Amino acid sequence: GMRLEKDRFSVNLDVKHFSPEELKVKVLGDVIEVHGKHEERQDEHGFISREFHRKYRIPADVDPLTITSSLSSDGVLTVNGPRKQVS
Amino acid sequence: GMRLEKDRFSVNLDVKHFSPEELKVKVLGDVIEVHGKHEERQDEHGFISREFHRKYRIPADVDPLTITSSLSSDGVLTVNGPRKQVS
Amino acid sequence: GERTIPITRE
Amino acid sequence: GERTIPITRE
């Protein structure tokens, strides 16, 4: 899920049933959305679909342009961004 | 899946992720459709959905009105109907 | 011990 | 060993 920490915002989600092309991480203003949709036409007789949609608020001290995302081999999606810190 | 046998038509599907109220078994003319949809609003941040849709042709020697369905404790949905037999 | 699943016919 | 997931910003 979402974890706000002293020096970063991060979201970690299980997305093992989705290929990278089936995932979308949208950052617009101070909102992050994560979406996934996976469909299988198993056969002549039908299909299965699964999907998810999540939305989170980015704290004001995270520049949304600094948000990035990566996907691990075991299917965990991480979205993260640094918070402004003292120099 | 679907199994046509000498004396019955039957469909067995895993539907363990669906409650009975989330399943629909439609028989119209010589077509059976099975549908399921399950959504969870896990939280403030979003939801997950899953669904399936299957369609099968009923053989001409099965009266569609004789098709019935039941759901087992372990989440297998059975749809079945007898075929006309010699008396 | 099965639950009957009603058929939709419309 | 992570794959970068591009951010959609529109």
UniProtKB/Swiss-Prot annotation, chains A, B:
Lens as well as other tissues. Expressed in myocardial tissue. It comes from the Eukaryota. The record marks M2 as: Susceptible to oxidation. Residues 2-87 form the sHSP domain. The modification N6-acetyllysine is found at K26. Zn(2+) 2 binds at H38, E40. Zn(2+) 1 binds at H17, H45, H53. Transmembrane segments: none annotated. It is found in: Cytoplasm; Nucleus; Secreted; Lysosome. Heteromer composed of three CRYAA and one CRYAB subunits. Aggregates with homologous proteins, including the small heat shock protein HSPB1, to form large heteromeric complexes. Inter-subunit bridging via zinc ions enhances stability, which is crucial as there is no protein turn over in the lens. Interacts with HSPBAP1 and TTN/titin. Interacts with TMEM109; in the cellular response to DNA damage. Interacts with DES; binds rapidly during early stages of DES filament assembly and a reduced binding seen in the later stages. Belongs to the small heat shock protein (HSP20) family. May contribute to the transparency and refractive index of the lens. Has chaperone-like activity, preventing aggregation of various proteins under a wide range of stress conditions. In lens epithelial cells, stabilizes the ATP6V1A protein, preventing its degradation by the proteasome. It is linked to Myopathy, myofibrillar, 2: A form of myofibrillar myopathy, a group of chronic neuromuscular disorders characterized at ultrastructural level by disintegration of the sarcomeric Z disk and myofibrils, and replacement of the normal myofibrillar markings by small dense granules, or larger hyaline masses, or amorphous material. MFM2 is characterized by weakness of the proximal and distal limb muscles, weakness of the neck, velopharynx and trunk muscles, hypertrophic cardiomyopathy, and cataract in a subset of patients. This is Alpha-crystallin B chain. The chain holds residues 68 to 153 of 175 of the full protein.
